[PDB]
Amino acid sequence: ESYITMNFDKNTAEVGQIIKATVKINKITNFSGYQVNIKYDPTVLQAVNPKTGVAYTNSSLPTSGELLVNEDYGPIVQGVHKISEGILNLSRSYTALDVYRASESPEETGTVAVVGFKALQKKATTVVFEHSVTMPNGIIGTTLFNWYGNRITSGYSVIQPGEINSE
Amino acid sequence: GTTVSGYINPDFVTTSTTAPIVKAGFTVEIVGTTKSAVTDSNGYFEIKDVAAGTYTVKITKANYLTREIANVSVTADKELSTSASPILMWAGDMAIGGTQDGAINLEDILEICKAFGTSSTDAKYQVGLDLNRDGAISLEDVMIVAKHFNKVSSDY
Ligand SMILES: [Ca+2]
Ligand SMILES: [Ca+2]
Hints:
heterodimer; A: Immunoglobulin-like; 1 helix; B: alpha+beta; Immunoglobulin-like; Type 1 dockerin domain; four-stranded mixed β-sheet; Endoglucanase (chain B)
């Protein structure tokens, strides 16, 4: 029953309205960090900060979820996008892995990131996790890690979100 | 043939102590030939007697992202870079289990974090994880990787 997915707060949007895409995990054993690569159509959707609406540049950082926010484990965050190609690449992780393990309180289920999409056009479009050569061993553009610092190579599914503004 | 030379520098801040450790040991190869050289403590390489032609020059070192410079025209003695404007190399494509994946990504950061907060007086410190060779495995090493995060060789 383990997975990573994206959920939209809204699956329909007029031009100028912001859709919040939340990256969510379920039952990832001893989860310590993620990196995901996301493909969208930049003519249809503009990536923006979901809280403020400030448009993403290629360095804009993801909005935090409920996981990876314990400051005692030294969270770090990356955003390295190609907005002209409709590619976002987002990552967040803990650095003080030993301290995290000593808590015996693993984070395994919950939201991990939020990104905003403002509609530029009304037409049907998709946001999906997508393979990147920057993550050659990714599972459909996803890499998840445990608190020993290792990539989790099996045991979870990638569930793509539904279409936006379909029909 | 003629001489192809130049300078390679890791892309992070160094001191008089750490510079000679990290500038040495980059292999520079003229692809499709037997001609190569290794950088000295100043980052300098010199490849003797290269036949005229157009080549890819490949630069490698453990725990660095490999760089290939395409379309290098050799017709005479040729300096590819200077000490003032060296060829930069990006630390943090880590050899994990003896193998690098050809990308700088989160796996590289977490490989270092397995030893987060250690120093060279600790048994758990590994010099290869101490990218800047300052005797500590710290956030500074992680930030060296983060500088060129989510990149592959074609991004040079
Ligand atoms: Ca790597
Ligand atoms: Ca260091």
